């Protein structure tokens, strides 16, 4: 029972004449439909990351007073040290 | 890292007497520029030097800039039995 | 897989000093390492001059 490339010419069901008799499956005219972006505003992860996770990771809104009142002085110290190391001493 | 002692000494001698190495990241280049070993051998030996200290490494557009350090300039004298504390190699040797 | 070695002293070349006597034999090849190599069926195969090789065992 020889098969292979020589068995390809012997093998039935392969060929345009007998593929054209069989009907097209109906999935060929369908669509993938948007990779589940129909409710992308609705978060589907199931985390819904809480108030603490954003008020302690990037901080809350009320801690800006502690940040910039100390960020006033470090740049002034940088100016003082830059005048110290520029050409003085 | 099977690499002969004769080949290893020609990376270490060049690194001592000339200070730095540049090697393109192209393994099987079969010849490093101005080291007469394989480019894979150069990269492979200087990474082995880097891991125990002794060499700093930057990459920067596929070229592996290898620079000898202060612990490495002592290591290249001690284990390799090159003349002791008389040869800086090479940053202040001739040019200053 | 790669290589298994055997405990050895004498490589097919008996003894250079056997109670004051050289007891060497076994017609060699042109290797300066001479050294005595594989023979399957009337066919030696060289070890340093295995690239070009004229007369065998």
């Amino acid at each position: 029972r020889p098969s292979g490339n020589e068995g390809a010419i012997r093998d039935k069901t392969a060929g345009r004449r007998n593929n054209r008799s069989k009907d097209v499956t109906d999935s060929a005219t369908t669509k993938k439909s948007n990779t589940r972006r129909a409710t992308d505003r609705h978060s589907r992860t199931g985390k819904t990351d809480t108030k603490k996770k954003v008020n302690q990771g990037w901080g809350d809104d009320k801690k800006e007073l502690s940040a910039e009142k100390e960020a006033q002085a470090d740049a002034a110290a940088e100016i003082a040290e830059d005048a110290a190391e520029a050409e003085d001493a | 890292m099977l690499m002969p002692k004769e080949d290893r000494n020609k990376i270490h001698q060049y690194l001592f007497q000339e200070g730095v190495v540049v090697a393109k990241k192209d393994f099987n280049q079969a010849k490093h520029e101005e080291i007469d070993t394989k480019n894979l051998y150069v990269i492979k030996a200087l990474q082995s030097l880097t891991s125990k200290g002794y060499v700093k490494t930057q990459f920067s557009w596929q070229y592996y800039y290898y620079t000898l350090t202060e612990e490495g300039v002592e290591y290249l004298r001690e284990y390799l039995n090159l003349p002791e504390h008389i040869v800086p190699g090479t940053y202040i040797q001739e040019r200053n | 897989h790669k290589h298994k070695a055997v405990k050895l002293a004498v490589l097919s070349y008996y003894k250079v000093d056997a109670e004051g006597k050289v007891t060497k034999l076994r017609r060699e090849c042109s290797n300066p390492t001479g050294v005595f190599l594989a023979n399957h069926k009337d066919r030696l195969y060289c070890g340093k001059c295995h690239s070009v090789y004229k007369v065998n065992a």
Partner: protein, 53 residues
């Protein structure tokens, strides 16, 4: 050693690579640049190529 880079890559996509990142696809080799089109947009002001029109 035996067959490690035994295939000829004297030509084609795999002969050349970006000098920044070694990427065979999307490369520009106009004027001997050999930078990919994604790194050329980053470095294009350092090369000297400016958006004018």
């Amino acid at each position: 050693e035996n067959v490690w880079f035994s295939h000829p890559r004297r030509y084609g996509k795999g002969s050349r690579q970006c000098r920044v990142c070694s990427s065979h696809t999307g490369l520009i080799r106009k004027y001997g640049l050999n930078i990919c089109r994604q790194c050329f947009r980053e470095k294009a002001n350092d090369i000297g190529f400016n958006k004018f029109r």
